[PDB]
Amino acid sequence: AKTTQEKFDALKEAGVFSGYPGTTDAKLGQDMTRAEFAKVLVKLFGLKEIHGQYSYKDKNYDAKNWAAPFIEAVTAEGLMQGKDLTKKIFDFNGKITVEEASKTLVTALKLEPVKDAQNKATDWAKGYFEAAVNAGLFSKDANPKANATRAQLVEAAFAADEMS
Ligand SMILES: CO[C@@H]1O[C@@H]2CO[C@](C)(C(=O)O)O[C@H]2[C@H](O[C@@H]2O[C@H](CO)[C@@H](O)[C@H](O)[C@H]2NC(C)=O)[C@@H]1NC(C)=O
């Protein structure tokens, strides 16, 4: 079985994840913004980027924001809808959590949420986290509410790619 690092290298060659300048360190212990994760989802699932459209009101969510085409693409695909509908806030600088990642991947893979699922996830997410655990995207001992580490995102993305 491939290590996290070998899984990363594969995803990177494929354009789905990136490294950092001037180092081979993949920084598997660090976190990831929701903007970057939207981009991961686009590259992982082969989605079309949507230019010149803005469905959120966050400060600096505009045409100069490199993430908008990715954010719009995952929004149009129904994978993500942001954090509150009435102010139209996506939170692109906020970090992706393991339960949030679970929802997007389970949805994209067309897997079904677990009903009556019992776990430590926020109420809205319990079914998606559990489904994700069952499909081997995250380990059952991951904290649904924590920022997902890049290592966790790599293992999820890799597993997701294998399933798709
Ligand atoms: C703090 O609120 C959450 O923010 C999450 C941010 O990340 C995602 C994956 C996103 O879409 O960007 O999920 C957001 C949460 O959205 C909730 O997603 C559920 C999963 O499908 C939906 O069933 C719920 O309708 C949605 N809202 C609530 C209140 O649970 C939920 N957002 C909202 C608007 O309720």
From TrEMBL:
Residue ranges annotated for the SLH domain, each copy included: 1-53, 54-119
Residues passing through the membrane, by range: none
The protein's name in its UniProt record: Surface (S-) layer glycoprotein
Whole sequence portion shown: 28 to 191 of 983
